[PDB]
């Protein structure tokens, strides 16, 4: 049976979405700030 990996270090591609979801939240924050600058009429 296939022997196992010797616990390689970690690198970026492995942690793929862990920064993309971050940037997505950042953009969501941007659009909410837009919404704030918008709500000055209500």
């Amino acid at each position: 049976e296939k022997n196992e990996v010797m616990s390689s270090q970690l690198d970026i591609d492995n942690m793929a979405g862990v920064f993309y979801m971050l940037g997505a939240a950042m953009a969501l924050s941007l659009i909410t700030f837009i919404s704030e600058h918008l709500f000055y009429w209500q």
Partner: protein
């Protein structure tokens, strides 16, 4: 008794190297950048309805401390900080996972098992083994057609001195050695760094020899049986082949030493001295 191979123990406590190991420098620098990224992001969102305070808050929430009284004042700053901390958890979590992984597959090597370990179909240069020059064990070598190939490799570095094979493995030049058991199982129990391989190879036992049909042939064997019935040989053995009565082994969990962990204490001292290097700085700036 039988035939068996001697090996040297492993001295297992040799696993860890550092603590920055499980990552790679790339990720280190990248997250170091991203923390400042979200810091200035928060501060700029704050100016458009606290800067160093906000940076403190953010770059702190990573390291689980509680220094800093800040908070988000807007709505979007709040909606951001939540997932900021969500991300934060993942980092240390994955760190635990990886460091655990590095200690479970931390299996240095499997000890060789018997003749039929196919590493000894044809060996490499990183594993030497032979018999003593002209030792009668070779008789079962050549009389059995298979080990001929091994016999050639066994003939490579045959140590001619039986009393020197122990030294040969004691010098790490040799590592494994083929021989009979009933002397090895005694030899391993001198110091527990020398171990057996447990696989019995050739079933036979010793005895007493007399010239053909002595008046004492059918006689003394009755004693040697009856004497072996009560307890004799067992006690004599425990008094002669049980010196130091050492136990064998486990796949050691390899508890960590200061000698491979203390790397963080270098950073401790570095932070110690950065204190005095920063001390007069803020005073003068005030």
């Amino acid at each position: 008794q039988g035939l068996t191979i001697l090996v040297k123990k492993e001295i297992p406590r040799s696993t860890l190297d550092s603590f920055m190991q499980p990552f790679q420098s790339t990720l280190w620098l990248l997250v170091g950048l991203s923390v400042h990224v979200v810091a200035v992001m928060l501060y700029l969102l704050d100016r458009f309805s606290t800067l160093s305070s906000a940076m403190w808050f953010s770059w702190g929430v990573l390291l689980n401390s509680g220094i800093g009284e800040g908070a988000p004042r807007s709505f979007s700053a709040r909606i951001l900080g939540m997932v900021w901390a969500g991300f934060a958890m993942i980092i240390v979590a994955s760190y635990t996972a990886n460091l655990a992984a590095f200690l479970v597959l931390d299996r240095p090597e499997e000890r060789i098992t018997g003749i039929n370990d196919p590493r000894l179909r044809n060996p490499s240069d990183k594993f030497i083994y032979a018999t003593v020059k002209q030792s009668s064990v070779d008789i079962y070598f050549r009389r059995q057609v298979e080990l001929s190939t091994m016999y050639r490799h066994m003939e490579k570095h045959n140590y001619e001195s039986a009393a020197e094979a122990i030294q040969a493995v004691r010098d790490n030049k040799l590592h494994a050695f083929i021989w009979d058991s009933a002397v090895l199982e005694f030899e391993a129990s001198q110091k527990c760094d020398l171990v057996t391989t447990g696989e019995l190879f050739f079933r036979s036992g010793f005895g007493i020899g007399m010239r053909k049909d002595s008046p004492w042939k059918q006689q003394v064997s009755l004693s040697i049986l009856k004497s072996h019935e009560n307890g004799f040989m067992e006690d004599l053995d425990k008094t002669w082949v049980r010196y130091q009565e050492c136990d064998s082994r486990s796949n050691a969990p390899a508890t960590l030493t200061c000698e491979n962990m203390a790397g963080v204490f270098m950073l401790v001292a570095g932070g110690i001295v950065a204190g005095i290097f920063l001390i007069f700085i803020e005073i003068a700036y005030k």
